[PDB]
Amino acid sequence: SQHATDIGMGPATSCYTSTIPPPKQVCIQQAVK
Amino acid sequence: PTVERSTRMSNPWKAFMEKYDIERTHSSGVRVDLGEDAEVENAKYRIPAGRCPVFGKGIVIENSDVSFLRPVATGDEKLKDGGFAFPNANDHISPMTLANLKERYKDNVEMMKLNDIALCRTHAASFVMAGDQNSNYRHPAVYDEKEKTCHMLYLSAQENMGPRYCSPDAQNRDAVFCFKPDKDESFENLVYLSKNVRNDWDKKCPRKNLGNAKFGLWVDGNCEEIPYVKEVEAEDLRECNRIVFGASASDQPTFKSKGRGFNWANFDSVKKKCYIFNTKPTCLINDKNFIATTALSHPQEVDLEFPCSIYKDEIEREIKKERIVLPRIFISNDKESIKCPCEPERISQSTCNFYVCNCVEKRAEIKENNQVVIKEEFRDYY
């Protein structure tokens, strides 16, 4: 996981928010393998 | 009425060459860009941070026929069956055509001022993680200029090698893939974008290759050859541009390059040779046989119009100031303007029909490390 972090692998994510008005919650349909 | 030579040591190429100061303007890795740290859930992550677009760059997935632009594999799909792009969501934020981005932001006045690449970048960079964010972490994007499509990237990773870290074996479908950044025909219309790319990248960043030109170093009144370069065989401009990109500033662990690296190259289109170097250029040499390229630059676009008037404009500009103080500019297309004590030499490879006055007192020179230094005789005056 130190290699993973070092090469640019990111955190487990699902929900996001756009900061450009109008704000809206966008969620990833299926969890990333 | 007197005429004399100025002792002021400047450089007429300053405003023109600013976009080629990759360390100042991009300020991060090129081949592999992972210049910004981000803390998410008390864990540290690396994200691309470059302020310039990287033209023609894509990610090659080893022993896979899936393009990196395909969404990442999700749940019921195997890692190796997907790409790097953002997966399907409740709102279709990625991939997004230009027409879709234009519809989405039709009421946003400020966003109507953005160019296609800046619009794709701003769109992708607007998405913050929900709930406890506190993070500066954003996803990078890839804008396809041919398909006019914006792709948000789920993965910020650009290179993965080493049998213990990845499996190139296509018969091992469950494990992690091997990948590397590269430039090739299939990626030529692509624009790799970190969250930090300048909206005014067209004025501040490289794009087009400079025809009838080679990068050089300004040495007291003339643009001189870079002494320490690495020569490589390159069949064409695309090859030279691929070589310089491969050798360019890398943030990949062996880790922040800050844009330092072998970012620039001179292509000899007659000899079929690529000369790569790691020192920022400060001027151009007008040579009909060369193309000046960078690791950020488009793999194919060429601007053949050398700025011929740069020297004459500056001489004439200064003369608009009886004491005449001529600037330390020893090259021009108006041979008489230089006021050379001997006959100026006619540069045959110069499309601008430049003349150079070689017979003048030089106050600077280039040393072993491509550093331009003031001569010892003059160090005290300056």
Author numbering:
A (entry chain B): 2037 to 2069
B (entry chain A): 43 to 296, 335 to 401, 414 to 474
What does the paper say about this structure?
We have determined the crystal structure of AMA1 from P. vivax (PvAMA1) in complex with a 39-residue peptide corresponding to the extracellular region of RON2 from P. vivax (PvRON2sp1) and, in addition, the structure of the cross-reaction complex formed between PvRON2sp1 and PfAMA1.
Crystals were obtained for complexes formed between PvAMA1 strain Sal-1 (comprising domains D1, D2 and D3), or PfAMA1 strain FVO (comprising domains D1 and D2), and the peptide PvRON2sp1 (39 residues: Met2034 to Leu2072; PvRON2 residue numbering from PlasmoDB entry PVX_117880). The PvRON2sp1 peptide occupies a groove of PvAMA1 that is located mostly on domain D1 and contributes the majority of the contacts; however, loop regions surrounding the groove also contribute to the binding. The peptide is boomerang-shaped with one wing formed by a disulphide-bridged β-hairpin loop comprising the central segment of the peptide between residues Cys2051 to Cys2063, while the other wing is formed by the flanking N- and C-terminal segments. The solvent-inaccessible surface at the PvAMA1-PvRON2sp1 buried at interface is 2893 Å2. The loop 129–134 undergoes a significant conformational change upon binding PvRON2sp1, with Asp133 moving by more than 6 Å, and the loop 171–176, which is completely disordered in the apo PvAMA1, makes contacts with PvRON2sp1 and could be completely traced in the electron density of the complex. The loop 148–151 also contacts the peptide ligand but shows no important structural differences with respect to that of the free PvAMA1. Finally, residues 296 and 297 at the N-terminal base of the disordered D2 loop contact PvRON2sp1. Although this pocket is absent in the PvAMA1 crystal structure, the smaller side chain of the equivalent PvRON2 residue, Thr2055, is accommodated within the flatter topology of this region of the binding site but is positioned further out relative to Arg2041 in the PfAMA1-PfRON2sp1 homocomplex and, indeed, to Thr2055 in the P. falciparum heterocomplex. By contrast, the side chain of PvAMA1-Arg180, the residue equivalent to PfAMA1-Lys235, is constrained closer to the protein surface by contacts with a symmetry-related molecule, closing off the pocket.
